[PDB]
Amino acid sequence: KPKVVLTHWVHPEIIELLSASADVIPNTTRETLPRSEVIARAKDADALMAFMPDSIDSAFLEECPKLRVIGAALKGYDNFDVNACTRHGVWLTIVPDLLTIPTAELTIGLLLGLTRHMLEGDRQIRSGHFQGWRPTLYGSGLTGKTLGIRGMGAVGRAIAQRLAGFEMNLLYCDEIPLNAEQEKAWHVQRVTLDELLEKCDYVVPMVPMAAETLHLIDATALAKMKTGSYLINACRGSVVDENAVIAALASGKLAGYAADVFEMEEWIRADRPQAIPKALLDNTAQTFFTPHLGSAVKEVRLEIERQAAMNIIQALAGEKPMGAINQP
Amino acid sequence: MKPKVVLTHWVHPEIIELLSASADVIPNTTRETLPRSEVIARAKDADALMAFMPDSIDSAFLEECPKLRVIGAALKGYDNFDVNACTRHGVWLTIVPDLLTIPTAELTIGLLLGLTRHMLEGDRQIRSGHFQGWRPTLYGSGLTGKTLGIRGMGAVGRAIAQRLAGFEMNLLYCDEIPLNAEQEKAWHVQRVTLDELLEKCDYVVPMVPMAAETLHLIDATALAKMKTGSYLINACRGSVVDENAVIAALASGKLAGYAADVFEMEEWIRADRPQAIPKALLDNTAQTFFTPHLGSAVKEVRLEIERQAAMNIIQALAGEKPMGAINQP
Description:
PDB class: oxidoreductase
Keywords: Phosphite Dehydrogenase, oxidoreductase
Radius of gyration of chain A: 22 Å
Oligomer: homodimer
Chains A, B: Phosphite dehydrogenase
Assembly: dimeric
Strand order of the largest sheet of chain A: 8-7-6-9-10-11-12
Organism of A, B: Ralstonia sp. 4506
């Protein structure tokens, strides 16, 4: 009977589901196991469920010569050597379209919490000094203001759809435009990038790479934005220069910065910092942060785990896994 | 008394005999989709249900079927089931393996030949009783020497490339993950970017796998990049083609023809869904060719899908964990 290693905690139903066709080595804790321990568990495994902090490379795959399938519970595969997985006869599978909506909804939450000073607000209530309304924490509203979605991939369309009823002025830029049916329905108007930066009170960078590279909201892009604008990054840690944000925050150019992702997460880069800049951590007045909760919805995580499990079950049964992106 | 199985769509007699060994079978004797109210009337006290693509199993449905123990879906996916609701109600939810690869590829090639050789118009001329010999009409477009491109090289895309390999074409493909060097050589299929594929191909075949899907891969921007008089074939998913953009390109002459086995109409999970196929496509009998989702309409395949769905139901009713379970109730 084959053996499947799960690197991170999954719901008990996923373990029962996998158990009929394999012996399951689960992570009973909610912490990331070190790479040495993951390799030790998977050394004689036939299947592995990988998560975001997993980095499958040539070294990993040669330590695990019995690996037949890696069911990744992820949308992207930037920490997998896909061709090496092919080299080693390992099915590599992903899970699409499940992370789009909860990332769009958390992006909107990030916008409201930052523009309405909801964090400072909660600090005022817990302090125990609340004795009624005060002329404090005046923020910026949504209606009548201009929001720009740079990049109109899956998540951007889900944000535009949800912001359509907020009576905003919605701008977007993308090399590929939406059609007039979509543009009219979400009342979203296409512009260029320089136009987006100049006119927008809120900027939301959001497209999975196509014509772009890294650090695209940089000091140059920040110099083009409206003074007192806001930037919301729930996309990827690499698209925003965090030191440029610190400077723009201090110069007054930016009024706020909210983020679900950080530069320290990009283990694929060598210019990677190893912490979130203290200047951003100390600025509770102008920042709003969450620890990569873009898909941290109980119901969604369960369906993400289920899809990874079914890929593993299918590959172990000799079928082609539904989520496969390669061919061993 | 035996447990009761409700089958929401027609199955082959051999499947009803198979199920009837272990259960009382309430079949659909017609080739029609029953209204949801009628399905709930039959499954109100059913122990098992065989679901198909037009079925939508939600929490409201399960509350009206308290005796349900297993739903044997005759599908490869489960996008139309509330899986967690099935688990909380103690209902096994099962699927079947993907058996649609080869019969879809064969139908896409059928779509390509029928469209490019005016075979529909041709049949219409014969049926009119006016045929009395060869005539210089219905001059269409050939395969040999022309360039065909497959956007997305999944299982279906490979099945098509393998089959077209003998047609002496210039095959192009674009995909994030490259084909094996061995298959690139065997099928003489050459890898290019998306922009090069649209610029050079006489025939464009969007065939995206499940793991690489996005919306409107063939849109106004893509059509504007394509060669004038090119042909588009869509037997993948409706959402990958912007049908209204297709209509414009057919009108402007940019597109010479469009063949489809799938339609945006079918995506009840997307919100920008229309409820009918556009009339401008239905009326354009000279430049189109459609079939009503016949991608896997092959008897031996349909039978095997039914057989495996029935096996899951039979196993689950016997107290076993069904072979195709996707949950643990």
